[PDB]
């Protein structure tokens, strides 16, 4: 999918998590978020469309998704072990990282 769709999916699955009732629901939502984040990593953001694929901006962009996924991964662990409330908190606080990349490249 293209970058905007993947970003909508992250934003929407965050909403799924915020109102989820059990760890299985949070697990599936974080799973779809992880895939979308790595899919978004393969795109080129409009602001960087005419930079080299190997530019420092493009690698800071791509590395942001690695960093996001690392936090999703530990949130996923919590949900895998039944910690609904902690995984929800871990998930909602991803917004800090969302906003940090947005300030630079959105
Ligand atoms: C950089 C590594 C990013 C991270 C991490 C997140 N986002 Fe993002 N976002 C990024 C860019 C470069 C853009 C612009 C996309 C474009 O094509 O113009 C966006 C945009 C969004 C949007 C708007 C989507 C749209 O319809 O135009 C949303 C709703 C959004 N981003 C949400 C979002 C969330 C919830 C994130 C954390 C889970 C997140 N983003 C991370 C770059 C990056
Ligand atoms: Fe970790």
Swiss-Prot record:
Q: Which residues bind heme b?
A: 7, 102
Taxonomically, the superkingdom here is Bacteria
GO terms assigned for molecular function: electron transfer activity; heme binding; iron ion binding
Task: Name one cellular component (GO) term.
Answer: periplasmic space
**Record-stated family:** Belongs to the cytochrome b562 family.
Q: What does this protein do?
A: Electron-transport protein of unknown function.
Q: Which UniProt keywords apply?
A: Electron transport, Heme, Iron, Metal-binding, Periplasm, Signal, Transport
Q: How is the cofactor bound?
A: Binds 1 heme b (iron(II)-protoporphyrin IX) group per molecule.
* UniProt keyword Heme present: yes
Q: Which cofactor does it need?
A: heme b
Write out the transmembrane intervals. Answer: none
Question: Which protein, by its recorded name, is this?
Answer: Soluble cytochrome b562
Q: Could you describe the subunit structure of this protein?
A: Monomer.
Supply one GO BP term. electron transport chain
Output compositional bias ranges, type Basic and acidic residues: 47-60
Species of origin reads Escherichia coli
- Coiled-coil stretches are none
Q: Where is this region: Disordered?
A: 38-60
